Design a protein around this ligand. Sequence first.
Ligand code: CUO
Lengths: 70, 69
Amino acid sequence: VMIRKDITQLDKRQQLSLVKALESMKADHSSDGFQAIASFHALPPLCPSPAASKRFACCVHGMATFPQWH
Amino acid sequence: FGYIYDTLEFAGWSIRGIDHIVRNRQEHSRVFAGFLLEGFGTSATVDFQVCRTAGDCEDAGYFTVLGGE
Ligand code: CUO
């Protein structure tokens, strides 16, 4: 039960963690890292394959699957 | 009295969290001043400070009591 709350409700400590965590995430060299994670949604496009000539953006947008993907 | 509160929490601490935290608070030494409240007249607020033998004095803290005739 990880809890998601309104951003406003959040405690300073709660905020503290998020700020530090994201900042560290930014640094994260790993594929799990933030920059890498960002690429999932859009450019660089990963969808057809991570290395493919034509790449499309990962958007199952305009589809029923859309909420699940997000 | 059929009424409820949307949430029961104190400053973001879970009830379980609260209990755990309180035990931790005990972990460190603490000094307290105890006040016996005899009963005042009209409402009044009290401020107290601790003064050293040297004569330095620091505002200890304050509390108030509500009252009337
Ligand atoms: O971004 Cu793809 O949806 Cu909000």
